[PDB]
Every structure is written in C-alpha cells, then in structure tokens.
RNA sequence: UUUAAUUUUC
C-alpha cells in the first residue's frame, strides 16, 4: 500500500466509515492523518461534521466547526448546508436560520441545496407559508428550482392535508420541465394513501417508465394494511418484481398484523425476517412490544424487550414510552423503574414520557 | 463532502 496517501484517500475512508456507521473508527483516522504530516481540509471537516450530525452528536459537530475556523480553514457553502440540515433535523430551527444569515455575512451565496435544505426544515416545522416564501425567493435570485425542491414542497403540502395543491404543484413541475422521479411519485402515493384515496394511489403507481423501488411498495403496503386490506398487502409483498423487501417492508406488515390481532402471522414474519438475513432494528421490537401490551399480554412484551438487549438493538423513547404505558395500565413502581433506567442509558425523555407517569 | 419519499409509542 505504502505511494503517499493523499488527503483524498483519508477523506474517502472517513466518509465511508461515517456512512456507515463506525463513527469512532472515522475520527481515529482524522487523528492518524494529522500526526502523519497530512493536513485536513475543508472537505475533511465537512465529512466528519455530517457524520457527527447523523449520529446525533450535533453539539460535538459544532466543536469541529469551531476548530476549522481557529485553523483558518474557512467553512464554505457546504459546511453551512451540513449545519443547516443537521440543526433542522435535531429541532433547532432558529439556530439553523441563524447560519442562513451568517452565510451571507461572510460572502457565501446561499445554494439550491441551501434553499432545499431550509424549505424542508420549514415544512417539517409546520411552517408551509414560510416554505413557499423561500421558494419565491430562489426564483427572485434565479436559482433554478429542481426536482428535490418540488418534491419537498409536494411532500410539505401533502403532510399538511393540502393534497389538491400538491397535485397542482406536480402538474406545474412537468409543464416547467423538471421531471419527477420515483421519490416525487412515491410522496404523492404517500399522500393519496394517507387521505383514504387508495384507488388514486394505485392509479398513480401504474409510473413514463419510472421504476418503483422498495419505498414506493412500502407506501402501498402500509396504505393497504391501514385500510384493512391485509391480504391485498400480503399479495403486493409477493409481488406485483425484482425489489428485495427490506426491514421497513416487514415492520409495516408486522404492525398491520399486530393491529389486526393476527399475532401468529406477524411473529412468523418476524422469524422469517432473520432467516432471510434482514436484521430487526428498533422499530420491529417496538411494533411487537406494543401489539403484545395492547393485546393484554405484558409478560411476552417484556420477554421481547429483554431479548432486544440479548441481541444488540438499543432501546428508544418509543420503547420506554410503550412499556411505560403498558406497565401503568397493567396495574407503577416498575413503570417508574423503567423511567430511571431510560435516563441512565442516555435516552432523553419526551412529553408523553412525562404526561403518562405523572397522570401516579 | 451537504438537501426531498415509506414502518412502531393514536
């Protein structure tokens, strides 16, 4: 191997490890390169900063930003976009809108991605009419709205129940010549399904030839289970081909079948999951722990939760919130014992976590 | 190197 390894090799390696998901491996290269005479650059800082935001170490991300500036490695548009996205997705919207101000004070033009990144945050922050302002502002600066832009607004409008305006934006997109893709059509197929418009969802799935992927089939499967067509969704899972089901496919059906009472069927799909080399994440165990609790069967729910940690999947706010619920409803001290444990392990409690225990 | 879609606690 060793030709002098560049910065670009360490930058490829560090990104690769960041996604994913051995972040601790990544940062020891970052050290190992600086001790070797190889100086990290703007892209080396941006990689790690995005790695650390995805792994939810946002506060540790801004440490590295501080460190770049100190070094006189200037943060560029990308560094700022990584930060603006990371802050939105950790719920720091107004922090993120600060950096949007600061970018311009430093002579950095905001981007197509910067506007996309912020229109997304705005939409997900229940602020649609600000999202549509930022969309008016790109055009004012002739930054061409693209397929990620339109797909985001459409998602936005659907998730606010504003379905017939999403449809109206999909039309506009095409006559304006930005072509939809699998993600466009599959947000819309998410829309229509969530508005009880299953026929319409399937009629959009027919899409030019955009090849549906596993997400579009998970949309329809979830659409079918919620509408109570469990065997039409077991059919589509068969299916109407070449798409390998993944972990969400099984969770969606595991939930559908739990809700229905078909706990036999579900658990065999959960047993089938692992035979086919699809590891059960935190949501598979969540979905069942709920099903078992609400079916009155709190013993087996707890079995599953112990087994969770016999395996490697670490619990969740949902895990604890669900068991908290079921434990209290199962006629308190243990519910409260789970709550202490949730604080030691490192998970932060949410409103419901509080709302339940209290309401003692 | 950075942005959009589907699953679990209603």
Author numbering: 42 to 43, 47 to 250, 252, 255 to 287, 290 to 380, 382 to 409, 411
The study reports:
Each PPR repeat aligns to a single nucleotide of the RNA target in modular patterns, making these proteins suitable for the development of exciting new biotechnologies. A typical RNA-bound dPPR protein adopts a right-handed superhelical spiral structure, with its target ssRNA molecule sitting in the interior cavity and interacting with corresponding PPR repeats in a modular fashion.
To verify the RNA selectivity, the dPPR proteins dPPR-U8N2 (in which N indicates any nucleotide) comprising 10 dPPR repeats with different 5th and 6th repeats with different PPR codes were constructed and purified to homogeneity. After numerous unsuccessful trials, we finally succeeded in crystallizing each dPPR-U8N2 in complex with its respective target ssRNA (5′-UUUUNNUUUU-3′), in space group P212121. When dPPR-U8C2 was superimposed on dPPR-U10, dPPR-U8A2 and dPPR-U8G2, the root mean square deviations were 0.73, 0.99 and 1.00 Å over 348, 367 and 374 Cα atoms, respectively. As observed in all four complex structures, four types of dPPR repeats recognize their corresponding targets by forming hydrogen bonds with the Watson–Crick faces of the nucleotides, which explains why PPR proteins bind ssRNAs instead of double stranded ones. Serine or threonine at this position results in a preference for purines, whereas the presence of asparagine is correlated with a preference for pyrimidines. The amide group of the Asn5 side chain donates a hydrogen bond to the O2 atom of the corresponding pyrimidine, whereas the N3 atom of purine accepts a hydrogen bond from the hydroxyl group of the corresponding amino acid. For purine, Asn35 or Asp35 form one or two hydrogen bonds with adenine and guanine, respectively. The N1 atom of adenine is a hydrogen bond acceptor, whereas both the N1 and N2 atoms of guanine are hydrogen bond donors. These structures demonstrate how the amino acids asparagine and aspartate at the 35th position contribute to purine base selectivity.
